Point group: C4
Chain length 82, copies 4
């Protein structure tokens, strides 16, 4: 898969995660973007997390759709930095 | 290993994690399912965690049985989405 | 590397992590073992963490020595379960 | 990529993470180094995390630049220990 396509896929995941957390959990756009990265990178500080059943369901979908995508994206970035 | 078999294996892990956390730690089915995903994806927010010695032992078993299974499942899902 | 040797290596990591956390941070053997798994699996709930400078240094060493070892161990366990 | 070059790359990431967290979030050099390892290893206890918008942005950059680098570094260390 071409690296630029992988870039677009991870950007789509990031938009999905950010907008979802913002609207479902009510955190700022900035906090939601931060939380999205922390989640899909699997860092998961827990400073932010879903507190609603919908937020929890949404988070599981983001986990499934985002973690693999982010992992592949970082791998490709390695090559272009190294 | 066929992707559908990997699907069944991760579903079995999810049932195991969810039922175990629910019965050992006493959280709702929904919270337990959420916690199971957060754990096997290695996100681990820490908003939920075991507070009993049995829960701690159980969590270690879920970690060992689930993390690899989930990792393989997300990899295969990548291919079917991309 | 033979799977049984990988088993011994991860067991050595587990002993190292458990004894270290117990003596440096003062948590029970059970809690320390649980924390060791949660850490080397990279789950990191944060329900337990080092609160001393020595504990922090020790945790970084466990992270470096343990995360790779655990990752290889789970991969090999996959094959023997599947 | 030569293992020594990978060593230098992860050391550069560690300096970047430590100095950044120290200056942006105001934690001690020791705490900042610890947080850097916990973050790039993806452990993310959440005992420490950014509380400013700049810190959050910085953390996302560290996540993107550091997680892959650390993953490759631990893999190479495995070979030299085993
Ligand atoms: K956490
Ligand atoms: K984590
Ligand atoms: K975590
Ligand atoms: K992780």
């Amino acid at each position: 898969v071409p690296a630029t396509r992988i870039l677009l896929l991870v950007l789509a995941v990031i938009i999905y995660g950010t907008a979802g957390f913002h609207f479902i959990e009510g955190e700022s756009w900035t906090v939601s973007l931060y939380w999205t990265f922390v989640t899909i990178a699997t860092v998961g500080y827990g400073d932010y997390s879903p507190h609603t059943p919908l937020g929890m369901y949404f988070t599981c979908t983001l986990i499934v759709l985002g973690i693999g995508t982010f992992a592949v994206a970082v791998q490709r970035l390695l090559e272009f930095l190294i």
